[PDB]
Amino acid sequence: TEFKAGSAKKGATLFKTRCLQCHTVEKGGPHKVGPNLHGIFGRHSGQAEGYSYTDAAIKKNVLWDENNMSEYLTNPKKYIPGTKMAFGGLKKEKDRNDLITYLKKATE
Numbered sequence: 001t002e003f004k005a006g007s008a009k010k011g012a013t014l015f016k017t018r019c020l021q022c023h024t025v026e027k028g029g030p031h032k033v034g035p036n037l038h039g040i041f042g043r044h045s046g047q048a049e050g051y052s053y054t055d056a057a058i059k060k061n062v063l064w065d066e067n068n069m070s071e072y073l074t075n076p077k078k079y080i081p082g083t084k085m086a087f088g089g090l091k092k093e094k095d096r097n098d099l100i101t102y103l104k105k106a107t108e
Ligand code: HEM
Pocket: 015, 018, 019, 020, 021, 022, 023, 033, 034, 035, 037, 040, 044, 045, 046, 047, 048, 052, 053, 054, 055, 056, 057, 082, 083, 084, 085, 086, 087
């Protein structure tokens, strides 16, 4: 145990305000700046087909679980140096918790 469940509603609104800009979550959603995230959890870093990932991502070969996702969310480039993800992070564990919740839920 190292991650706890937050508000999905709250997660939904954070995403729209901080991730929507570059990503879709729906099944059959298009990749945009960032890849479609439908089905992320269970998946390894940089394997969505038809998406052009940096070398960095592929090489990392992360198992997208809720826990990893939270560390990544605090600081992407930190986690996967060279990554083309241009996001500062989420310093608050409470905002991250909400988000992963939303994510866990909406990319399923
Ligand atoms: C919002 C805070 C947000 C989330 C959530 C998010 C998720 C995310 C993941 C989990 C990946 C890696 C997935 C995989 O391995 O297939 C990923 C990668 C990229 N993203 Fe992202 N991301 C969020 C924020 C944003 C924003 C605001 C942007 C655009 C300015 C963006 C874009 C990208 C890009 C580009 C990548 C690919 C990295 C690479 O190939 O090196 N994301 N995102």
